[PDB]
Amino acid sequence: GGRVLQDVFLDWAKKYGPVVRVNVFHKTSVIVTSPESVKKFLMSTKYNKDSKMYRALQTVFGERLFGQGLVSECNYERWHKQRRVIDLAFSRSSLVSLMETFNEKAEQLVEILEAKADGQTPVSMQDMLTYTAMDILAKAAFGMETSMLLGAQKPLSQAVKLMLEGITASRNTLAKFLPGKRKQLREVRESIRFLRQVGRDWVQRRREALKRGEEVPADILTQILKAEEGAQDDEGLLDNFVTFFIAGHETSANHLAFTVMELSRQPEIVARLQAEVDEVIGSKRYLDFEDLGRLQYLSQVLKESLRLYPPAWGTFRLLEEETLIDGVRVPGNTPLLFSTYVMGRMDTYFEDPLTFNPDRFGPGAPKPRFTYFPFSLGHRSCIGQQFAQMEVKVVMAKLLQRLEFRLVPGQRFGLQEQATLKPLDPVLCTLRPRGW
Ligand SMILES: CC[C@@H]([C@H](C)O)n1ncn(-c2ccc(N3CCN(c4ccc(OC[C@@H]5CO[C@@](Cn6cncn6)(c6ccc(F)cc6F)C5)cc4)CC3)cc2)c1=O
Ligand code: HEM
C-alpha cells in the first residue's frame, strides 16, 4: 500500500480542524491548514524556515549533502545574498535560451521510446523521465552532458538513487537500525561523496575553460560561483552545486512521472491534449517559447497533476513568538508545517477532491486562494518554477505529439516518499505510435 505520512496528516486535518499538533519531528510542531494562515506566514519575510527542520537536508548520515545551499539556508540575510545573485540565472532571456536544450533532450527521449513502441516492451517511464530531466539539468545549468538517456553515467545515477533512499531512512529508524545493514549506511555516505566530487570536477572543468580565456555563456553555475566569490572554501559552492543538481531534476522527474501515470487512465483528457498539440505545433519538431504559452489545456492538466501529486508537498516556518492561529494559542518556538498535498485533498477547498479534473484551472475559474502551492509561496518559493514549467511542457508536448502509453497491468497508482513524493511503482508502460 502506497500511503505516505502526508496521508495521515490529511486524515488529521479533516478530523481535527486547521491547527493540529504532531509529534513525528524534533518537536511538537503544528500543521497549519487554513488558507488565511498560509497567506499570513508564507507571504511575509517576517517568518523564516526552521533551521532544525532543514538540518535533515544540510547533512545526511554525518555527510554534507545540501549544506547551506539555496534551499536549506534558513537565515534570511545569508539567504537573500545568495538569492539576489542566483536570480540572474532565471531571467526571461536566461530561460528562453534553454529552449534548445529542452527541445534536444525531449526529442531524444521520444526517439528512444518510438524505438521501443511495439506495444509489448515494458518501459519504466519513471526511469526514462528521470534520465531526461537529468540530461536537461546538467546541460542547462552546468554546461555538461550526462547522456543518461544514452546509457551513460550509470554510477552517477546510482549515487543519486542511493542518496535519495538514504534520505528516506535518515528520517526514520526507529528500531529498524539492527535489520537495515551497515551496507546501506556506507553506500549512502559513498553516494553523497560521489555527488560532491562530481561538483568538484565540474567546477574544475569550468574554471579550466575560463582560464584558457574561453567564452562561457551565463549559467546557473556562473551564478553559483559568483555567489561564492570571497569565500575561504569551495564548500558553500558545492552545497549549491548538489542542491541544484538534485532539485533541478528530481522533482521535475516526479512531476512528469505522476502526470504520465495519471494520464494512462484519462482517455478523454488525453484526446483533448492530442487535439491541442495538433493545432498549436502540428507535427513540427522544435517548440518555440511562444508555442508554450498556447498549450493552455496542457497547462491545466499539469496544474491539476500538481494539486493531487505535488512532489514537494510543503514547507516549514519557525513561529518565534506565541501567536494565536485560527483560535488556537500556539506557543513561541514552534515549527509550523504547511502542506499543499493536504489542502489539495480537502473537500473544504476542492469539490470532489479525488477526481482529476483539469477544468478546475480553466480560464475564468477563480484561481485557488492559498489552497494550492506546489512551488510554495512568498520569498522562499521555488526559484526554478518557470524553468520547470517550461521543460515539463516541452517533454509532455512531444510525448503527446508522437506516442500513446498503456500502463502495464499490476502497476499501482500509489505514492512513496523519498526526498519528495513520487510514484510507488516505476511507471511501467508499453508504447505505440500515435494512431495505433
Ligand atoms: C529516533 C529518532 C528520533 C529521536 C532521536 O528520538 N527523532 N528525532 C527527531 N526525528 C525526526 C526529525 C525530523 C524529521 N523530519 C522529517 C522530514 N523533514 C523534512 C525536511 C525538509 C524537507 O524538505 C523537502 C525538500 C525541499 O525541497 C525539495 C523539493 N524541491 C524544490 N525544488 C526542487 N525540489 C528539494 C530540495 C533540494 C534538493 F536538492 C532536492 C529536493 F528534492 C525537497 C522535507 C522533509 C525533516 C526531518 C523526522 C524525524 C526523529 O526521527
Ligand atoms: C515541477 C518541479 C518542481 C516543483 C514542484 C518544485 C517545488 C518547489 C517548492 C515547493 C519549493 C520548496 C521550498 C521549501 O522548502 O519551503 C522549491 C524551492 C526551490 N526549488 Fe523548486 N520545484 C521544482 C523544480 C525546480 C527546479 C527545476 C529547480 C532548479 C532549476 C528547483 C530549484 C529550487 C531551489 C533552489 C529552491 C529554493 C529557492 C529558495 O529558497 O530561494 N526547483 N521548489
Tab-separated table of C-alpha atoms and ligand atoms in Angstrom, residues 49 54 70-71 79 83 90 137 220 243-244 247-248 251-252 255 306 311-312 314-317 373-376 379-385 387-388 391, ligand 2:
chain	number	residue	atom	x	y	z
A	49	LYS	CA	12.476	28.408	7.543
A	54	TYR	CA	16.259	21.742	7.248
A	70	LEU	CA	19.710	27.947	-1.570
A	71	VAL	CA	17.036	25.556	-0.238
A	79	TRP	CA	19.701	33.598	2.006
A	83	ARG	CA	19.139	34.566	-3.998
A	90	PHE	CA	16.439	32.642	-14.077
A	137	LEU	CA	19.629	19.878	-15.950
A	220	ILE	CA	23.275	28.671	-13.089
A	243	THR	CA	21.259	21.372	-4.331
A	244	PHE	CA	20.768	22.337	-7.985
A	247	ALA	CA	16.392	19.911	-7.044
A	248	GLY	CA	16.770	20.801	-10.669
A	251	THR	CA	11.084	16.881	-8.665
A	252	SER	CA	10.597	17.696	-12.404
A	255	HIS	CA	6.000	15.568	-11.743
A	306	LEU	CA	0.459	19.137	-9.145
A	311	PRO	CA	6.363	16.091	-5.362
A	312	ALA	CA	7.345	18.814	-2.937
A	314	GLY	CA	5.069	21.654	1.556
A	315	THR	CA	7.469	23.598	3.761
A	316	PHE	CA	8.213	24.595	7.394
A	317	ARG	CA	8.468	28.002	9.068
A	373	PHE	CA	1.126	25.942	-3.783
A	374	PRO	CA	3.068	23.163	-5.477
A	375	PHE	CA	6.044	25.649	-5.805
A	376	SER	CA	5.491	27.176	-2.316
A	379	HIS	CA	10.160	34.849	-0.654
A	380	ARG	CA	11.147	31.162	-0.287
A	381	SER	CA	9.103	29.951	-3.282
A	382	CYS	CA	10.813	27.855	-5.942
A	383	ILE	CA	13.471	29.698	-7.912
A	384	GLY	CA	13.108	27.054	-10.660
A	385	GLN	CA	9.359	27.289	-11.153
A	387	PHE	CA	12.371	26.599	-15.699
A	388	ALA	CA	10.375	23.509	-14.551
A	391	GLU	CA	10.837	21.867	-19.581
B	2	HEM	C1	7.828	20.598	-11.101
B	2	HEM	C2	9.099	20.605	-10.276
B	2	HEM	C3	9.287	21.461	-9.283
B	2	HEM	C4	8.486	21.663	-8.045
B	2	HEM	C5	7.129	21.059	-7.747
B	2	HEM	C6	9.246	22.358	-7.175
B	2	HEM	C7	8.693	22.923	-5.906
B	2	HEM	C8	9.453	23.586	-5.010
B	2	HEM	C9	8.986	24.020	-3.646
B	2	HEM	C10	7.710	23.522	-3.005
B	2	HEM	C11	9.943	24.699	-3.020
B	2	HEM	C12	10.316	24.242	-1.611
B	2	HEM	C13	10.515	25.412	-0.692
B	2	HEM	C14	10.601	24.937	0.746
B	2	HEM	O1	11.303	24.017	1.194
B	2	HEM	O2	9.863	25.641	1.577
B	2	HEM	C15	11.035	24.835	-4.060
B	2	HEM	C16	12.326	25.546	-3.838
B	2	HEM	C17	13.353	25.528	-4.667
B	2	HEM	N1	13.475	24.861	-5.815
B	2	HEM	FE1	11.911	24.017	-6.815
B	2	HEM	N2	10.381	22.753	-7.752
B	2	HEM	C18	10.569	22.105	-8.921
B	2	HEM	C19	11.538	22.293	-9.827
B	2	HEM	C20	12.691	23.201	-9.656
B	2	HEM	C21	13.759	23.100	-10.451
B	2	HEM	C22	13.794	22.869	-11.953
B	2	HEM	C23	14.834	23.837	-9.728
B	2	HEM	C24	16.174	24.261	-10.301
B	2	HEM	C25	16.398	24.593	-11.574
B	2	HEM	C26	14.387	23.971	-8.463
B	2	HEM	C27	15.113	24.855	-7.508
B	2	HEM	C28	14.729	25.007	-6.262
B	2	HEM	C29	15.510	25.764	-5.251
B	2	HEM	C30	16.919	26.294	-5.396
B	2	HEM	C31	14.631	26.238	-4.387
B	2	HEM	C32	14.958	27.090	-3.171
B	2	HEM	C33	14.603	28.530	-3.533
B	2	HEM	C34	14.867	29.483	-2.401
B	2	HEM	O3	14.626	29.098	-1.146
B	2	HEM	O4	15.266	30.614	-2.667
B	2	HEM	N3	13.095	23.574	-8.419
B	2	HEM	N4	10.715	24.014	-5.184
